[PDB]
């Protein structure tokens, strides 16, 4: 089989700071599961993530490498990418863009 990452071009999500949320990077493989990581884009560099962290959920013919936001903070705004090392090669996914609304400082007047 061919390894590949299935994030759609211009993927975006709109979520509330304060709620929990997961991003799911769909990974295709068959033989050995590849080492996957997530990173947030800050311009030129994609800085890797490790503090509030990741996990796998495996489905029939496609698995999901999951970045957990527990809860989502206001500063979690921005673009995110997963990368997969398989047999020395590297697959760079389309980024997905989180638009977090700061519920604390957001007010309905009505």
């Amino acid at each position: 089989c061919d390894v590949q990452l299935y994030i759609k071009r211009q993927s975006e999500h709109s979520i509330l700071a304060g709620d929990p949320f997961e991003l799911e990077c769909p990974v295709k493989y068959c033989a050995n599961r590849p080492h996957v990581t997530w990173c947030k884009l800050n311009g030129t560099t994609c800085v890797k993530l490790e503090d509030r962290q990741t996990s796998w959920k495996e489905e029939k013919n496609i698995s999901f490498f999951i970045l957990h936001f527990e809860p989502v903070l206001p500063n979690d705004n921005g673009s995110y990418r997963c990368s997969a090392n398989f047999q020395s090669n590297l697959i760079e996914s389309h980024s997905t863009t989180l638009y977090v609304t700061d519920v604390k400082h957001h007010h309905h007047h009505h």
Binding site: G43, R81, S88, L90, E92, H94
Partner: protein, 100 residues
């Protein structure tokens, strides 16, 4: 055309650039990501890139009184400086040194 800092143009749409130390082997689609490939020995790329071939490593010929102040790696170019007891006589950086 309108690609973000981390994306590059292929066809009429944008695409994820490869990491430093890697070149583009196969281009993205609408749903699929960009396949990247390690730079061969003696080549490098220093930044996020959509290059299908890596750049050549700078050489530091000892016959020109040059020692490598830093080696070439896949992610970094080699930078030539002068060898023990030598001073620069040709300039971006030094390309030749004479002895004292």
């Amino acid at each position: 055309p309108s690609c973000k800092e981390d994306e590059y143009p292929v066809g009429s749409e944008c695409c994820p650039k490869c990491s430093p130390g890697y070149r583009v082997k196969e281009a993205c689609g609408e749903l699929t990501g960009t396949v990247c490939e390690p730079c061969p020995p003696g080549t490098y790329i220093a930044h996020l890139n959509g290059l299908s071939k890596c750049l050549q490593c700078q050489m530091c010929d000892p016959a020109m009184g040059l020692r490598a102040s830093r080696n070439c790696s896949r992610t970094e170019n080699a930078v030539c400086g002068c060898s023990p007891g030598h001073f620069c006589i040709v300039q971006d950086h030094c390309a030749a040194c004479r002895a004292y």
